[PDB]
Amino acid sequence: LPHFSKDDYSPESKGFVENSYLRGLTPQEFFFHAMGGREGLIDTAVKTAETGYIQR
Amino acid sequence: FIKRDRMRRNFLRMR
Amino acid sequence: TLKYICAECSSKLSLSRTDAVRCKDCGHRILLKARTKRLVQFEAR
Amino acid sequence: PNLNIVLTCPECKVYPPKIVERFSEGDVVCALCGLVLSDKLVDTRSEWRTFNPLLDGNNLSTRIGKGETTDMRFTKELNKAQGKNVMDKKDNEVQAAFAKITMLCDAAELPKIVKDCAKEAYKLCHDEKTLKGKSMESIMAASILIGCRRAEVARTFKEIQSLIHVKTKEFGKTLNIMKNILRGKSQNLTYIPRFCSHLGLPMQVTTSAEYTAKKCKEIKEIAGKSPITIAVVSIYLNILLFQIPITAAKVGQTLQVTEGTIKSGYKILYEHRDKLVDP
Amino acid sequence: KPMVNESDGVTHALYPQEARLRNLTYSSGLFVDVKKRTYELKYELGKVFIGRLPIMLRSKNCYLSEATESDLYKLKECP
Amino acid sequence: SLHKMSMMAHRVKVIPYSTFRLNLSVTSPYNADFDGDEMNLHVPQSEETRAELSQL
Amino acid sequence: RNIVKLNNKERITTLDETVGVTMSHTGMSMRSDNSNFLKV
Amino acid sequence: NTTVLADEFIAHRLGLIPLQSMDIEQLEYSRDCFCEDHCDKCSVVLTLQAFGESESTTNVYSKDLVIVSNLMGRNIGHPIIQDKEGNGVLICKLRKGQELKLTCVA
Amino acid sequence: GQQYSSAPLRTVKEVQFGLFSPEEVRAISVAKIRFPETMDETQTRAKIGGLNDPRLGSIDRNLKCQTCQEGMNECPGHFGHIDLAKPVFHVGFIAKIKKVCECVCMHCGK
Amino acid sequence: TTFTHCEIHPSMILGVAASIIPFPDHNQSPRNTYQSAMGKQAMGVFLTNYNVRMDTMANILYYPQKPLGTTRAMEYLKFRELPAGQNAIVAIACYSGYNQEDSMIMNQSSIDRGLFRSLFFRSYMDQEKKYGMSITETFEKPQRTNTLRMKHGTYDKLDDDGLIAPGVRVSGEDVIIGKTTPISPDEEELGQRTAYHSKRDASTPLRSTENGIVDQVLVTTNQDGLKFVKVRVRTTKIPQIGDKFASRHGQKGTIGITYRREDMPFTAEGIVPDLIINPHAIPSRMTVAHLIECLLSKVAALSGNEGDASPFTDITVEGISKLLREHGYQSRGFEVMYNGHTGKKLMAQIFFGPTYYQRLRHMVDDKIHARARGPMQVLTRQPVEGRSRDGG
Amino acid sequence: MIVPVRCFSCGKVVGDKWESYLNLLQEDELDEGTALSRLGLKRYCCRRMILTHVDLIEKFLRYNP
Amino acid sequence: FNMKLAINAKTITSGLKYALATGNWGSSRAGVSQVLNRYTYSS
Amino acid sequence: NEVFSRPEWMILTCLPVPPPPVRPSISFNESQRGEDDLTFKLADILKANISLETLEHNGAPHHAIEEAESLLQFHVATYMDNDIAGQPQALQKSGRPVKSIRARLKGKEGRI
Ligand SMILES: [Mg+2]
Ligand SMILES: [Zn+2]
Ligand SMILES: [Zn+2]
Ligand SMILES: [Zn+2]
Ligand SMILES: [Zn+2]
Ligand SMILES: [Zn+2]
């Protein structure tokens, strides 16, 4: 993200969400969590679309 | 922890 | 004839058949049909 | 040879079929003994969902155009084959005539109803013996004027004449014999709002020229001398009654009317000014 | 500005409400200054309507862009 | 309906309102949840197919 | 040099007339000829 | 009804309005009385007529209801007024040029 | 709900798939269909000898379908034909015929 | 150190639909997506000029209410002025088993007082046309003596012009607009066409399953001068068991059963829940924001100030627990409930508090349909497709 | 809209408290909780009605009939 | 020559009205124009 | 097999005409009558056949005979299978491709 430095290999900047759902999440973590959610939805959709063809 | 919606009286009493 | 009402000026026209669709006194072609003059029963439930 | 299916109730047999049709159940039933007359009812709305006899008739045709995966050589060979078979029917004149008439009507900004009435009139005339020519321009202009007279529309002869140069006289003869054709196959008030639209006048002057036009039609004297001059002198009086200034030169050059004619009618009109007041 | 030419031939101003009620197309007329010349070879010797253009609402060409609150209530358009 | 359990016979109990009422021990072979899910109900028109449908 | 960065073009002019005049000049207006062009 | 509100909506609001119900013991039910429709033994007839007068909006209160039916010595049909200003329940608002006439059967 | 028939009722067993011979097509058909028009010139009934004449099947319930009689809910249909003056090829066989042209002589036919 | 720019506010990274979500940070992303999808179909008030428009299929709620846990972005989205839902007192418990699998129990007395009741406006537009000027469709009242192909519906509600005046209560299979088409004697001659002689019916009736009160009827000439007529009928749709409801956290579900006040659990103070949901919704879906919105909505309902429900702020759960503790209730949202049938105290305290809910377009009255011997298609002679065409 | 009659839970009459409520807000300039404490509402079931009401009839009356 | 038969207006009127009327923008492009969803304000 | 298939039978000479029970036409409002696509294809086969017979009866331009022969071959080919690769696609006057029998037997939710 354009909010960190370059060549940063720290775990926080690379996607680690150290906060919990009880105290909320930071923007740079909510964005990655949104990426994981959309990826989950797309993966489930593809798995179903292929599951139907396999079933037939 | 609540939305401050009385800013009209504060701005009218401050300006 | 049947009672009609003008769109904008809301005047009572009551024009008959073969009179096209146009208000008198103004050129608004939107003519209302007006509500029925009989009672309508309703239930509060 | 017969082929007419008539539904009757063999149990009732007391009257011709006075039956009821149940569409939700798909049956037809006698409304007396309650006995069904037919099951499995067909629909007309459902077959229509996927989809002109009045003009094209029963003729069928299909286009040939290029395909998704095809060569341009085959598209030309198929179109040239239809170009050699186009002489088998003399219906090329109807599509071209309707195309040019479509261009003229689309150029005159007339509604589609006048277009369909004019196309229907040209289809009624088409290629008869009493026409005997007119070089395709006069039957088109006269057909447009006929479709205008049928749809309660008003278009002056100088307007279509301004569109098509039909030399007036031959236009009048072709329009007369065409009217005889229409009679063998068995109103100036509308002009006022049009010229009031050409001058941009309020509604009170329009309806005032309407009452003035009707009253002047009832008073007689001069009778008309063509209704156009009665219209322009009526609007001229109704506009000289108010204060909106146009004078006689501007209205004479806009509506294409002679100044001496609107003053000649304004004289006797001013003489009959008495009984023309609406309020 | 937006306008409507009826069937009889009268053309008047159009409002989006009457446009929705009469199933019309909210468009405006377009004219072009068409110039013609005749050369005879460099020897040298009109506001024509070209078509209508649909106008988006709340735009500099629509009537509603300059309207106020009470004016929108007069034209029966929600603010 | 990807299971042979997804289509099963049932005993009709006439109840008012407009929703199909059923026990929750049958929603697992149907893979259903009570959130706007519609189902289909077919009726046999013969005694032979009704008995064969009840014994199988 | 800062002032040269202020070049603009003229916007489209909206005819404000009563429409019926222009719309009368559009279609049939009983006025032909008035200009010699392709008249042979 | 020229109001901007719906008709059955106003009927619902009128249905939610409370009324006095003291001597309701000796008022028979609608099904128990042998007359057709209603009579002075089963129900109480009320009515409402509102019309906007000046430019300021007029407010229709529950006190605007009047009793046009005989009570035979009962004390029901009176709109319960529990406001400190002496105004009934705000049923609806009306402007100049809108009428509202209805008859309710309590 | 259809009308009773006296023919013996049996099930459908063996199904044979084959090509339609032109002689059998002419023996099954009942009409020639020469007019490309749909309905009659009077804009009603049928063209009689055209694309949809009473010699074929019919719909609209009211019509009787001349050559079966009965009704549309009973009419299986009837077949016409088109006798061409120039033989044409079938799409689904264009390849196969070609293969035959590569399997047999083009003169002595051996 | 080399920060060249700074973000105005992080909450602006969300779109319009996600801006309505209260505390989306404390909620998982797919629930924010599901709520962002359900926010495009909830009932509400889109504009104020709906009284002078003829829109097709409209739904205007009776008592639209603004939420308690509001987001600042709503101030820019005109949500407080045009809300699309109502705040309902909600308890989270496993009552009589009618709450399982996203099922909800709604108070009947609250429904009778006008809770989540909405209006539906259906517009039927008809138009007469002329083919070749010779055949002209005319709006008129068809007579049962000379009109062929007449529908079995009643024609007593039509006037002399062939229309229904507004205010007349209409039901299904009722003709709203009467239109007849001229026919030729030698064109069909089917059945009794040689006896009726006159015209053929072609009216546009109301839907088979619909009913209501005609709201407004207007007649106008269109572009080419054809006299068309638009009709608008209104119908109040009382919330039924089969109706679906959603919230602002991806929680969606229909009503399980409706009970009355004496049949609903109640607290020691006397507040009856208007809606109870199944606990098993929460852990699986991992929507913690649904509880935080209920708690902060309770604190907002007690203190009288709408709580700020922005995504990225400094508001924590402990502060809301303290603010609720200052009002006398339990800081964790629990409250001692009593049974409705026996009046006995429940062993486990119930999470009880108001929550903003929305009503979706999906309703049972537009879904239930049964077919037993109906119309067949013309091609395959099989049952048709569609509920309006009585399909199987 | 236009002041919901009764309440959606307890059932107490609140329609006669709107005019006073606004009157207490525009005249005494008190807070919302103080005004709701002066009207007599002691349960939040009622409080959500007046507190979360969106009066849209005012925006409906500005249209000419 | 005539100015009413040379410059036509139904090409521009039919082109703009047809392109803004149908989903196609002339199949190249489809689904460009959609009916406005008036379910609520946020929709 | 002699009793079922012949290479001479593979070449089309006479064409069967299916009844309207296969291609049901519609007469809506008595003035808006719609005919199926196969009906239009049969009309094309008739126009191309009669045209070819007329061109082969009087005279022989040798080129118009091949153009009419390829035209009839195109109408029969598109009648059997309109979606043929390497060949132009026949389009109806409404703006949609011609619905053939193969299209009724090929795509999903069809006859099978
Ligand atoms: Mg589901
Ligand atoms: Zn008027
Ligand atoms: Zn009978
Ligand atoms: Zn009684
Ligand atoms: Zn047959
Ligand atoms: Zn309460």
Side-chain angles (χ1 to χ4, degrees), chain F residues 33 35-37:
Chain F
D33 50 330
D35 44 326
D37 293 32

mmCIF file of all heavy atoms in Angstrom, chain F residues 33 35-37, ligand 1:
data_model
loop_
_atom_site.group_PDB
_atom_site.id
_atom_site.type_symbol
_atom_site.label_atom_id
_atom_site.label_comp_id
_atom_site.label_asym_id
_atom_site.label_seq_id
_atom_site.Cartn_x
_atom_site.Cartn_y
_atom_site.Cartn_z
ATOM 1 N N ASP F 33 -32.170 -23.731 4.070
ATOM 2 C CA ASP F 33 -32.206 -22.834 5.213
ATOM 3 C C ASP F 33 -33.404 -21.907 5.061
ATOM 4 O O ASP F 33 -33.766 -21.515 3.948
ATOM 5 C CB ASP F 33 -30.907 -22.027 5.338
ATOM 6 C CG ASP F 33 -30.508 -21.360 4.039
ATOM 7 O OD1 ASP F 33 -30.835 -21.905 2.963
ATOM 8 O OD2 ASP F 33 -29.865 -20.288 4.089
ATOM 9 N N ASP F 35 -34.603 -18.955 4.829
ATOM 10 C CA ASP F 35 -34.279 -17.619 4.419
ATOM 11 C C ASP F 35 -34.718 -17.399 2.982
ATOM 12 O O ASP F 35 -33.884 -17.119 2.132
ATOM 13 C CB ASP F 35 -32.775 -17.415 4.509
ATOM 14 C CG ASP F 35 -32.013 -18.580 3.942
ATOM 15 O OD1 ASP F 35 -32.507 -19.716 4.084
ATOM 16 O OD2 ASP F 35 -30.929 -18.368 3.357
ATOM 17 N N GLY F 36 -36.003 -17.533 2.686
ATOM 18 C CA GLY F 36 -36.465 -17.267 1.343
ATOM 19 C C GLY F 36 -36.313 -18.410 0.363
ATOM 20 O O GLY F 36 -36.484 -18.192 -0.842
ATOM 21 N N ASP F 37 -36.002 -19.614 0.835
ATOM 22 C CA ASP F 37 -35.824 -20.755 -0.050
ATOM 23 C C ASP F 37 -37.176 -21.341 -0.435
ATOM 24 O O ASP F 37 -37.993 -21.665 0.431
ATOM 25 C CB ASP F 37 -34.958 -21.823 0.618
ATOM 26 C CG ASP F 37 -33.526 -21.368 0.816
ATOM 27 O OD1 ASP F 37 -33.310 -20.158 1.031
ATOM 28 O OD2 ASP F 37 -32.619 -22.223 0.752
HETATM 29 MG MG MG N 1 -31.086 -20.339 0.671
#
